[PDB]
Design a protein around this ligand. Structure first.
Ligand SMILES: CC(C)(C)CN1C[C@@H](N)[C@H](c2cccc(Cl)c2)[C@]12C(=O)Nc1cc(Cl)ccc12
Length: 93
């Protein structure tokens, strides 16, 4: 994953915007850095992740599961996480 991906400007779709607004998000255009931070905050706030769980996020009965279309995912699979996030936004250029 190149460093530049973090600077990508994005407009989240309604479901993702709903999720972001729960952890402070105020805006309609974000950087991918912001989106990844607010998602991370959402995950740790809802205890969907822990280091004793083999690096897995459990989102089966949660908004995040509906957004991503999976009951769970590994935090090590970075490219797959970007793909899941991209289905819920539109890039700005
Ligand atoms: C899981 C937790 C430790 C709470 C947060 N992790 C730690 C980072 N290594 C990871 C991450 C950072 C940047 C890009 C990616 Cl692809 C993944 C990240 C994160 O910072 N945001 C975010 C969002 C989602 Cl949906 C999944 C995983 C993450």
């Amino acid at each position: 994953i190149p460093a530049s991906e973090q600077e990508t400007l994005v407009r989240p779709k309604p479901l993702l915007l709903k999720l972001l607004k729960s952890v402070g998000a105020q805006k309609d255009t974000y950087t991918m850095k912001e989106v990844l931070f607010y998602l991370g905050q959402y995950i740790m706030t809802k205890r969907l992740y822990d280091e004793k769980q083999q690096h897995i996020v459990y989102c089966s009965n949660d908004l995040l599961g509906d957004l991503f279309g999976v009951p769970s995912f590994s935090v090590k699979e970075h490219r797959k996480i970007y793909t899941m996030i991209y289905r819920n936004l539109v890039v700005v250029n």
